[PDB]
Design a protein around this ligand. Structure first.
Ligand SMILES: CCCCCCCCCCCCCCCCCC(=O)OC[C@H](COP(=O)(O)O)OC(=O)CCCCCCCCCCCCCCCCC
Ligand SMILES: CCCCCCCC(=O)OC[C@H](COP(=O)(O)O[C@@H]1[C@H](O)[C@H](O)[C@@H](OP(=O)(O)O)[C@H](OP(=O)(O)O)[C@H]1O)OC(=O)CCCCCCC
Ligand SMILES: COCC(CCO[C@H]1CC[C@@]2(C)C(=CC[C@H]3[C@@H]4C[C@@H]5O[C@]6(CC[C@@H](C)CO6)[C@@H](C)[C@@H]5[C@@]4(C)CC[C@@H]32)C1)COC
Ligand SMILES: COCC(CCO[C@H]1CC[C@@]2(C)C(=CC[C@H]3[C@@H]4C[C@@H]5O[C@]6(CC[C@@H](C)CO6)[C@@H](C)[C@@H]5[C@@]4(C)CC[C@@H]32)C1)COC
Lengths: 325, 149
């Protein structure tokens, strides 16, 4: 503790300054690992012993500790809290899969009630986290808690699932709509496992690299979108010239050109052999347009995107390593 | 069952030929590179498994809302989404054209999920895997050459 500097250790001063090169030093990492290990003395092979201890309380006594009171010492380490939370989340995910896979009855099953309890208590904990924030302004605590993206997506998912639950406890059609809302919602909870993955040394950097390659890829999404839209409009306006205006036109533009570049290159679905059906005027340009579009979208743009990912990997790798540390 | 165990054995004995192959100068290093590249690949296999499971659960729970609890459910989650990203993207088996069948509630979301799932699994993760294999090749090659010698 530093008396002159208002009871702040060097680590807190370094963190407040956003000094990445200081925290990422070897000594700071060793100190953080020692603090994370708590009061235990398992170094060579940990984690599995933590799982064995949390599953079997008698296994706690056969551990080496640092200088009755052993159980409270073990259970309050950060690592065992993390593993307890991870096991709880795995159980919640299993129950959320089970409730949506099988048929849903009029009133919720007990597993569904467990899922509702999990969501409600997690919302309560988030509310507690908001309420006990450091700044003294009740409006600035919300804006200082909405600084990450995970705690924003959690709020959105909690609100959406609450809306779906309220819609569920109704008659049959609104119950089906609530089921569809649950089906959409489960995707986010499955994706959220990357936050749990982020503890592992070799997975966090990969997640950060993915997060940056998303914005690296967002442009070659747009260019391929333009090419695909052009081809789709051309094929739709060549093959079918006698269609009344309907919203089905907006589906044929994006459907077939998108499914064509992913292996469903069908010469019978498009370019029909027109006993034999009558041939449309100017319909012999569809194979040529398709050939050019496939050549551009599968040999040029994807290879250029591969090159872009390849040549900017060292910088992103180093930055992600520093940020995770 | 005897011949099935024989099939498992012949799988292993066919794989065992690489130890004989590791005599030639240009084949031992490639095998010892394959081992470390598999060690690298396992992580992206895990991530793709998570994404695949998410899409499979969403599809199964959207399209069929009146199924019974059976072990066939654990197959439909993994089977079709895994075979989809390997060149079988048949848009007829997925999203049936709901004379015409009555549409399921929210049966239009499935192609919207499919677009994002294919975009992630064929344009992002595999390209990042290629980049990982590319930027960590020289040191692996040198170490493999030394260990073979
Ligand atoms: C908003 C939730 C609505 C739920 C209903 C719809 C859900 C379907 C879409 C899923 C959207 C989930 C949002 C998760 C994105 C937040 C990432 C983040 O927090 O950044 C932290 C982190 C950085 O924040 P920093 O502290 O500012 O640096 O960046 C990442 O780690 C990126 C991790 C996400 C990348 C992989 C996941 C993308 C998969 C989406 C593909 C859709 C699958 C469909 C099958
Ligand atoms: C779904 C998982 C999401 C949570 C992810 C959980 C985070 C995660 O993936 O790692 C935790 C644990 C291994 O990590 P853990 O910290 O326990 O132990 C590390 C490991 O022994 C390394 O080999 C050590 O050296 P290095 O690093 O090689 O140099 C390292 O010491 P250090 O030399 O570094 O000081 C040790 O810290 O693995 C499991 O999940 C076991 C349960 C199996 C899974 C059980 C379920 C199948
Ligand atoms: C053919 O007739 C069968 C019948 C017995 C039926 O028993 C059922 C018991 C529930 C059970 C085991 C069954 C089918 C889906 C099973 C789900 C698959 C899910 O997968 C997992 C997959 C991976 C997890 C990550 C997510 O959930 C489970 C939560 C989930 C899971 C294992 C819950 C358990 C379900 C079978 C015969 O007896 C008379
Ligand atoms: C089933 O019967 C339908 C009928 C109502 C029909 O209303 C029509 C109004 C015009 C509208 C919305 C319709 C079909 C093609 C639609 C085009 C698709 C084009 O796509 C876009 C695609 C993307 C844009 C970038 C380019 O253009 C539009 C210029 C274009 C677009 C959105 C213009 C709008 C057109 C439906 C029901 O009423 C009784």
């Amino acid at each position: 503790e530093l008396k002159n500097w208002s009871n702040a250790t060097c680590l807190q001063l370094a963190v407040a300054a956003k000094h990445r090169d200081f925290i990422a030093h070897t000594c700071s990492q060793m100190l953080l690992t020692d603090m994370w290990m708590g009061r235990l003395r398992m170094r060579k092979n940990s984690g599995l012993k933590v799982i064995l201890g949390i599953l079997l309380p008698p296994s706690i006594l056969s551990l080496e500790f640092k200088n009755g009171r052993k159980i409270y010492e073990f259970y309050n380490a950060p690592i065992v809290k993390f593993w307890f939370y991870t096991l709880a989340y795995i159980g919640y995910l299993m129950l959320f899969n089970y409730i949506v896979l099988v048929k849903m009855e009029r009133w919720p099953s007990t597993q569904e009630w467990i899922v509702i309890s999990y969501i409600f208590t997690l919302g309560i904990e988030k509310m507690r986290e908001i309420l006990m924030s450091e700044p003294g302004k009740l409006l600035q605590k919300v804006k200082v808690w909405l600084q990450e993206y995970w705690n924003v997506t959690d709020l959105i998912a909690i609100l959406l699932f609450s809306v779906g639950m309220i819609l569920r406890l109704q008659d049959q059609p609104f119950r089906s709509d609530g089921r569809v809302i649950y089906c959409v919602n489960i995707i986010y909870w499955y994706i959220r496992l990357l936050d749990i993955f982020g503890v592992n040394k070799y997975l966090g950097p990969y997640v950060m690299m993915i997060g940056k390659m998303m914005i690296d890829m967002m442009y070659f999404v747009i260019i391929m979108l333009v090419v695909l839209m052009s081809f789709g409009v051309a094929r739709q306006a060549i093959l079918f010239p006698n269609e009344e205006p309907s919203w089905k036109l907006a589906k044929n533009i994006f459907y077939m050109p998108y499914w064509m570049i992913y292996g469903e290159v069908f010469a019978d679905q498009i370019d029909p052999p027109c006993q034999l059906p009558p041939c449309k005027t100017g319909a012999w340009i569809v194979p040529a347009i398709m050939a050019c579009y496939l050549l551009v979208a599968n040999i040029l743009l994807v290879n250029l995107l591969i090159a872009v990912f390849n040549n900017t990997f060292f910088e992103v790798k180093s930055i992600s390593n520093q940020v995770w540390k």
